Design a protein around this ligand. Structure first.
Ligand SMILES: NC(=O)C1=CN([C@@H]2O[C@H](COP(=O)(O)OP(=O)(O)OC[C@H]3O[C@@H](n4cnc5c(N)ncnc54)[C@H](OP(=O)(O)O)[C@@H]3O)[C@@H](O)[C@H]2O)C=CC1
Ligand SMILES: NC(=O)C1=CN([C@@H]2O[C@H](COP(=O)(O)OP(=O)(O)OC[C@H]3O[C@@H](n4cnc5c(N)ncnc54)[C@H](OP(=O)(O)O)[C@@H]3O)[C@@H](O)[C@H]2O)C=CC1
Ligand SMILES: NC(=O)C1=CN([C@@H]2O[C@H](COP(=O)(O)OP(=O)(O)OC[C@H]3O[C@@H](n4cnc5c(N)ncnc54)[C@H](OP(=O)(O)O)[C@@H]3O)[C@@H](O)[C@H]2O)C=CC1
Ligand SMILES: NC(=O)C1=CN([C@@H]2O[C@H](COP(=O)(O)OP(=O)(O)OC[C@H]3O[C@@H](n4cnc5c(N)ncnc54)[C@H](OP(=O)(O)O)[C@@H]3O)[C@@H](O)[C@H]2O)C=CC1
Lengths: 227, 242, 229, 230
């Protein structure tokens, strides 16, 4: 047995919503780790020296075409980070059907579209990491977020069903659940950074996370502790 | 303080998906409890013993009309049981966008449409019980259910967000999460499939629709006022974990 | 199939720490439900006309004697409510071994002693309800409660291992996890404390014929305080 | 903002139960990461590659003496990995008070004794990692383990209470929960294999690293999916 950090394997990575914000920090961290990193965008293009593909995750045909472009460039996606997401907060009595479904379609169905398309090759190659970006809200229930909490909790159920089916083929699905990212409900008494989220994603994309499936990694300063 | 079961209060109940199967058992239990029970149906009609309103939970306009019809008949809804649901199982690689979205739209968004419409009068009257029928799959992840597990876990997030907002106004949202429940569909699986499922159940038996209804009865009762955002698993221990 | 509440079965009940507080409300509720209710006490006696047995749950021999007295009076215990508990809070760097072990020994090991003794007959009769009284602190982690949170979370693990072994024989173990009960509001969505009778209502449900298919569950009675993961 | 892995900081590490098996893999991984690593043992000694201190975690005075010996060797403990543990399984009806209390005293109270002793200087320096090694059994309930599951779930409650109190001072407590691991030796495991001690060590490495500062009260399952549930 090797005592230290396992030898690095450069994986084909796709980060959806990887062109700015937390997604860009995730993409830059995975590239710095040594992975081949592609990001989706909706017109802004890709930053730094990352491979960009245009993709709206509400569009299944765009998702299919984006994955094909990534595969031609750098090989089939081995690590999917589904970071694309939106918030449309509202108290329950004021939340409209449109506002609920928009958040579901991007955050939950959009993550499904990417995971489903990624599985086409992951299962065949007997390796895959599907890493959903969830939220403390999924299990803690932020009060103006019936739609967002539903979508982000839904990622847990999806990750666990995917893992129960496919972990025997080397394909796992896990959730990183950030809290507030750049205080009374946060034990740490501070917000987190995008780089702290990216550090958990880096772990789940690494050779140190093969035996982790269906897990929620909370990056929230303890905010979401409970049951 | 009274020692025994609190005095019963007859609530206006609506059970979506209450016209057949497990939802019908839920509705019949709540009626036997003493509540005024209405059920939805999609055109096949109300059960002989229960007031029915035609309502497709994918149609926000139909949800609004149905709540108005219930209100006229028995007062505004105080206890909503969201049982309307469908399954479209598939291996992940085979699951189409349509199979995913149809399950989400009925099971998750349809439950939202009903909870949102119910909340109007619940907050104003400072009482409401929103009871989502989830599944062991939400937190345990039954294979071939990327859609169903996503929908049924989403009910937990929604229930907790609703509870954090509205519990102070006496409005709670909770989830009953059944495991394998004896139905016509389960008795039609091959015996190997039925036997294989028992291996994952510590109780080594399937549950009944009346056991699901017993948990719903509790959450609709005067014994559940201080329970909010909870998952009540009715699954013989199948879903134990984290 | 029966449409309404299942036919009632009058069970032999033992509530540990049943002479006051939450335990007394649990015992009185289960008696009103129609059960045959015994309580443990440490000298104060049982309330009402309930059957009392003297028992300190840190003493395995006393637990054995107490169950034998209940068995002789009303039949072997079918429903055990392990309510006896104590708290001894401290900041971590101030918490002593003594203060940690005292809380463990009563709240966790004491619950084990009662569950283990109850299992003598439950498995043979193919029925048992072991109901632990936990706390929101078990999974939420109230500060200054390294001992109490450890003990109350330990009840979850024990209930689940007991349930995985014995549910096939009709014996289940579950946890009722109260939040703040009148005998802080900033962390409670309901913006109120709970009552002992609300805890007892959850115990009544878990002792009833409506809860046979519930095993290893945590029923939170906390106004939403403990919501999380 | 730094794009890549944060600059490594060498921490003073103590791994209880680090002299053999899974704990030894944890200690060897943390040393390979660049940390200064000490392990406990109950008299058989540490392997020659690591500094060892004799310490029975059922003995509060021995825990105190062990921490002082580590302090004099490599500075006060900054990262505590509590791996010392035993199992004494039995059917519930057969399990004795002694068998229950022995597992609690080592696995739960012993972890407390070490976390309590570490806390003073961690709080003073405004940095601490307390990493309990739990088990899938804590939340999944392996049968015949009323004692082991109780102890390993108790670590979760303890980690959360410690985190709620001390996370604001830079001190966090988390749990790594292994499933079936090769060094300690299937339909319930989605991965359809046992894990390795080095896979557990990888999760501990993460929780000891500069990538885990904002994680407190978490359970990191290393179990092939075995424990998924609620
Ligand atoms: O997370 P955080 O960074 O904290 O929140 P942000 O709002 O800062 O980031 C949201 C991210 O998700 C992307 N996104 C949103 N909706 C879609 C969609 N339908 N298809 C593809 N990408 C989408 C955004 O791309 P965009 O730049 O196009 O908004 C952006 O990259
Ligand atoms: O077993 P089980 O899981 O209960 O499967 P079942 O067929 O037994 O029950 C499903 C229930 O959900 C209802 N339902 C499904 N989709 C909708 C919808 N869009 N709007 C309203 N009701 C709906 C069904 O009504 P119906 O079958 O009458 O459409 C039925 O009452
Ligand atoms: N807010 C709250 O009150 C909450 C309480 N709980 C739990 O509810 C349960 C009861 O709470 P509560 O009524 O408030 O506590 P109380 O102090 O009011 O009563 C505790 C009971 O336990 C008994 N007891 C304590 N130690 C022992 C022992 N070694 N052997 C036998 N009996 C013992 C006491 O008997 P005696 O009269 O002889 O002392 C008393 O009957 C406890 O488990 C507590 O942890 C959980 C969540 C919240
Ligand atoms: O078999 P395992 O492979 O599971 O190893 C158990 C580990 O825990 C340690 N351990 C168990 N009980 C104690 C204790 N009371 N104090 C310190 N270390 C302990 C053992 O040390 P050891 O082998 O020294 O007892 C060993 O390192």
């Amino acid at each position: 047995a090797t005592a230290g950090r396992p030898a690095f394997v450069s994986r084909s990575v796709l980060v959806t919503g990887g062109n700015r914000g937390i997604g860009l920090a995730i993409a830059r961290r995975l590239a710095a780790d040594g992975h081949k990193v592609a990001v989706t965008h909706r017109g802004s293009g890709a930053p730094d020296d990352l491979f960009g593909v245009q993709c709206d995750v509400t569009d299944s045909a765009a998702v299919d075409r984006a994955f094909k472009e990534v595969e031609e460039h750098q090989g089939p996606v081995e690590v999917l980070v589904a970071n694309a997401g939106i918030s449309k907060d509202a108290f329950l009595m004021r939340m409209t059907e449109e506002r609920f479904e928009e958040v579901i379609n991007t955050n939950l169905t959009g993550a499904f579209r990417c995971a489903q398309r990624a599985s086409r090759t992951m299962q065949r190659k007997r390796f895959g990491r599907i890493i959903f970006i969830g939220s403390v809200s999924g299990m803690w229930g932020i009060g103006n977020q019936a739609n967002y909490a539903a979508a982000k909790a839904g990622l847990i159920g999806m990750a666990r069903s995917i893992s129960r089916e496919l972990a025997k083929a080397g394909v796992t699905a896990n959730v990183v659940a950030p809290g507030y990212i750049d205080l009374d409900f946060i034990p740490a008494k501070r917000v987190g950074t995008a780089e702290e989220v990216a550090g958990a994603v880096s772990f789940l994309a690494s050779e140190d996370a093969s035996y982790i499936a269906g897990a929620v990694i909370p990056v929230d300063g303890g905010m979401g502790m409970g049951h």
